[PDB]
Design an enzyme around this catalytic site. Structure first.
Site, PDB file in Angstrom:
ATOM      1  CB  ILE A  22       3.120  12.890  -0.169  1.00 16.46           C
ATOM      2  CG1 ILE A  22       2.745  12.092  -1.413  1.00 16.46           C
ATOM      3  CG2 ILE A  22       3.188  14.189  -0.448  1.00 16.46           C
ATOM      4  CD1 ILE A  22       1.658  12.723  -1.584  1.00 16.46           C
ATOM      5  N   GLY A  23       6.097  10.702  -0.015  1.00 18.81           N
ATOM      6  CA  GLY A  23       5.859   9.059   0.280  1.00 18.81           C
ATOM      7  C   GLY A  23       7.519   8.546  -0.854  1.00 18.81           C
ATOM      8  N   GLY A  24       7.507   7.203  -0.179  1.00 22.54           N
ATOM      9  CA  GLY A  24       8.645   6.821  -0.694  1.00 22.54           C
ATOM     10  C   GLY A  24      10.121   5.360  -0.505  1.00 22.54           C
ATOM     11  N   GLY A  26       7.749   1.349  -2.101  1.00 23.92           N
ATOM     12  CA  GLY A  26       7.717   0.927  -3.452  1.00 23.92           C
ATOM     13  C   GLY A  26       9.085   0.958  -4.593  1.00 23.92           C
ATOM     14  CG  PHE A  27       9.540  -0.956  -7.238  1.00 24.00           C
ATOM     15  CD1 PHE A  27      10.851  -1.503  -7.388  1.00 24.00           C
ATOM     16  CD2 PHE A  27       8.285  -1.515  -6.720  1.00 24.00           C
ATOM     17  CE1 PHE A  27      10.771  -3.193  -6.588  1.00 24.00           C
ATOM     18  CE2 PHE A  27       8.493  -3.111  -6.389  1.00 24.00           C
ATOM     19  CZ  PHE A  27       9.913  -3.776  -6.563  1.00 24.00           C
ATOM     20  N   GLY A  28      10.280   4.228  -6.088  1.00 22.70           N
ATOM     21  CA  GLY A  28      10.037   5.264  -6.661  1.00 22.70           C
ATOM     22  C   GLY A  28       9.277   6.246  -5.635  1.00 22.70           C
ATOM     23  CD  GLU A  29      12.462   9.532  -3.387  1.00 23.47           C
ATOM     24  OE1 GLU A  29      12.124  11.298  -4.379  1.00 23.47           O
ATOM     25  OE2 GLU A  29      13.099   9.013  -3.164  1.00 23.47           O
ATOM     26  CE  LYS A  45       1.452   6.421  -7.466  1.00 17.29           C
ATOM     27  NZ  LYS A  45       0.764   5.070  -8.057  1.00 17.29           N
ATOM     28  CG  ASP A 136       1.830  -4.502  -4.173  1.00 14.80           C
ATOM     29  OD1 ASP A 136       2.303  -4.857  -3.747  1.00 14.80           O
ATOM     30  OD2 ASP A 136       2.417  -2.793  -4.453  1.00 14.80           O
TER      31      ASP A 136
END
Ligand SMILES: COc1ccc(Oc2ccc(Nc3ncnc4[nH]ccc34)cc2)cc1
Length: 294
Positions: A22-24, A26-29, A45, A136
């Protein structure tokens, strides 16, 4: 290009079945997973165990510290193996960045802006209160809940870039001479631009920039790609200009955060009163439709 960190279909710790990425960023998935113990969908995550900057240790620390508090995902699990590190937590709904972009002119009404703003300020005071800075604050780190009982609640979704700013007792830690910023240029305070140690007030600067972008639809440094150039603009900018489309009491908000520095605790009750007074002045009630409902 590299494959996904996890193959869809695998089972993590004989419990969490990976369903979809669902997301990619930042510093991971991040993945939607089925928790086969509780029989519910959850967020998973992950980060590579080899990548140069790993932040899920921070994610777990802060998520744990915030359990029982408002505006945070329920902690579900975590682990570290030779391939990847992972954290499991409550799955939420629509992201504020997406919801804003879906608006006619990329703007929210002052009703939606004030209610979201006050929830976000609550989430900032909460993370500060357990001794961490977020560092952030930006729209894509907030989402509404995905059930009838949670979809009017805004959740702080990620803590990867956080830093502990206190001792156990609440002593503010001596700042470093240089602090290399890794957050988002658009919502970053001048102190992030200057590679200064960030403080509680820097998270409130980022909230101020988020609120202005919500009501105006853009920030003055929207089109500027060079980080330094953005920094220069912010350093000289008369922030009073941003008051034009905010309720009058935001002059109090801006004067207060302008007065702060690393060593000065914010007056959270004063900043909360700006939202509470503005919401009463505008006759806003919690049950009013948000902009994406109507
Ligand atoms: C810059 O605009 C963007 C960037 C990224 C993005 O994608 C996502 C996708 C998922 C998440 N995070 C989560 N979602 C749902 N439930 C969740 N529980 C914990 C985190 C999380 C955040 C942004 C959406 C908008």
């Amino acid at each position: 290009e590299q494959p996904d960190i996890l193959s869809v279909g695998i089972l993590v710790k004989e419990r969490w079945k990976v369903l979809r990425k669902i997301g990619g960023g930042g510093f991971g998935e991040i993945y939607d997973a089925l928790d086969m113990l509780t029989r519910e969908n959850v967020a998973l995550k992950v980060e590579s165990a080899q990548q140069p900057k790993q932040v899920l240790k921070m994610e777990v620390a802060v998520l744990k510290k915030l359990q029982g508090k408002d505006h945070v995902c329920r902690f579900i699990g975590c682990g570290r193996n030779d391939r990847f590190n992972y954290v499991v937590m409550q799955l939420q709904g629509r992201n504020l960045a997406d919801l804003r972009r879906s608006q006619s002119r990329g703007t929210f009404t002052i009703s939606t802006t004030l209610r979201l703003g006050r929830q976000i300020l609550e989430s900032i005071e909460s993370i500060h209160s357990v001794g961490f800075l977020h560092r952030d604050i930006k729209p894509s780190n907030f989402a509404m809940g995905r059930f009838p009982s949670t979809c009017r609640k805004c959740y702080m979704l990620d803590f990867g870039l956080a830093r502990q700013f206190t001792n156990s007792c609440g002593d503010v830690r001596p700042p470093r001479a240089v602090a290399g910023f890794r957050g988002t240029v658009r919502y970053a305070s001048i102190n992030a631009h200057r590679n200064r140690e960030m403080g509680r007030h820097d998270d409130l600067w980022s909230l101020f920039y988020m609120l202005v972008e919500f009501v105006v639809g853009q920030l003055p440094w929207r089109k500027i790609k060079d980080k330094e150039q953005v920094g220069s603009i912010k350093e000289r900018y008369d922030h009073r200009l941003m008051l034009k489309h905010l309720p009058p009491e935001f002059s109090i908000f801006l004067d207060h955060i302008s007065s702060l520095d690393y060593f000065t605790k914010p007056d959270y009750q004063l900043l909360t009163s700006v939202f509470d007074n503005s919401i009463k002045t505008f006759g806003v009630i919690e049950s009013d439709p948000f902009d994406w409902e109507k």
